[model samples]
Target: GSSGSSGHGDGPGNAVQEIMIPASKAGLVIGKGGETIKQLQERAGVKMVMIQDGPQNTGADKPLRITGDPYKVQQAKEMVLELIRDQGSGPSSG
Candidate 1:
């Protein structure tokens, strides 16, 4: 029934977030041979969307794209942020 004006929904079920990282930091985020980012996707159950040549500017942070179920993105984001920090390195395949 129509009574008064309502509003549409901006579906919050799907999660899509972008994280910007400097080229130097992004190197770690992706890891050697892409192991780090690849494993992160598996652990967090999310997709680390890659945009070919997204980093147009020579001196700009790359826009790392992520997508998945709502909570999964947040989970993956934290792990990614961790890599950006200059603390200790991640795992190894030995």
Candidate 2:
């Protein structure tokens, strides 16, 4: 897929990037009440926003957005991937 952008080109220095993950896996990434997200933010110094869809979005078919400083965003992404790899198929609720 190609990346495109539309903007007035006016905003803070922050940048935004999007990531897609399975809805079934969203629980693993999000944890409870966004605890996992919060922890990611704290540890990686990035802002992650995950908009969860319904069961219709599964099998790496859903979308998630991670936005923040470039370095922090990269760090957050690495952490998320690492978590997924480590947890395997375990149920993650928090």
Candidate 3:
């Protein structure tokens, strides 16, 4: 409930941020059945919206938008980079 809405922040200190994940890596960000994405929403305390069209239609990357308290946003970014950095090279074959 504390997580702000996508592109909808009006209160003090509330903010919105967007990041790009290689479309090929979108699943890495989203995880299986959205488990990871959903988890971040709670753990990081942010509301996330994904746009796969428009400016996102390019082959470069997909847009991952997050909105909420600035503190939460920073936390989310830190956690996300941690996950990605620690991710094992290539998906598991097993």
Model 2 residue 54 lDDT?
A: 65
Give every collision pair in model 1.
none
- Model 1 C-alpha lDDT per residue in residues 1-94, reported as the tens digit of each score: 7698878887557788888766787777687767778878998999886444755656577777789977889988777876676545647644
lDDT at 90, model 1: 46
Flag regions of model 3 displaced more than 4 Å.
1-13, 55-59, 86-94
Which model, 1 or 3, shows the larger lDDT? 1
Give TM per candidate.
Answer: 0.64, 0.62, 0.62
Model 1 worst lDDT window (10 residues) = 50-59
| Total clashes for model 3 | 0
Q: lDDT scores for all predictions?
A: 0.75, 0.71, 0.72
Model 2 TM-score on a 0 to 1 scale: 0.62
lDDT of 2 by residue, 5-79 (tens): 766766678756677665566788788777877778888787888865563534645566778887778777777
C-alpha lDDT of candidate 1 relative to the true structure: 0.75
Question: How many collisions between residues are there in candidate 1?
Answer: 0
Model 3 per-residue lDDT at 40: 82
